Amino acid sequence: LHMKTSLPPGLPTQELLQIQASQEKQQKENLGQALKRLEKLLKQALERI
């Protein structure tokens, strides 16, 4: 019953897999395209040098 009641806090590991997949994919999607746009502007500045 301890093994049925002493579960660690938060949603379990098999659910934590898609939890971390969703969180890391939204973290990447919010930032990587912004980095690409920044690099495009920066290389525009490089060719304007």
Binding site: S6, P8, P9, G10, T13, I19, Q20, Q23, E24
Partner: protein, 53 residues
């Protein structure tokens, strides 16, 4: 000879209980270690990587 045979026969049956308890308690100790690992890994994923990072 037959007293020795009977004693050696009963020795294993009297023995097996303590290895049964030994494997049971080490099996529960494995569950405790796995629970501690699960807590540490969920701390590493959620607290250290998912939310803060």
């Amino acid at each position: 000879v037959l007293v020795g045979e009977q004693q050696q026969c009963q020795d294993a049956k009297s023995q097996q209980k303590e290895q049964m308890l030994l494997l049971e308690k080490k099996s529960a100790a494995y569950s405790q270690v796995l629970l501690r690992c699960l807590t540490l890994l969920q701390r590493l994923l959620q607290e250290h990587r998912l939310k803060t990072q």
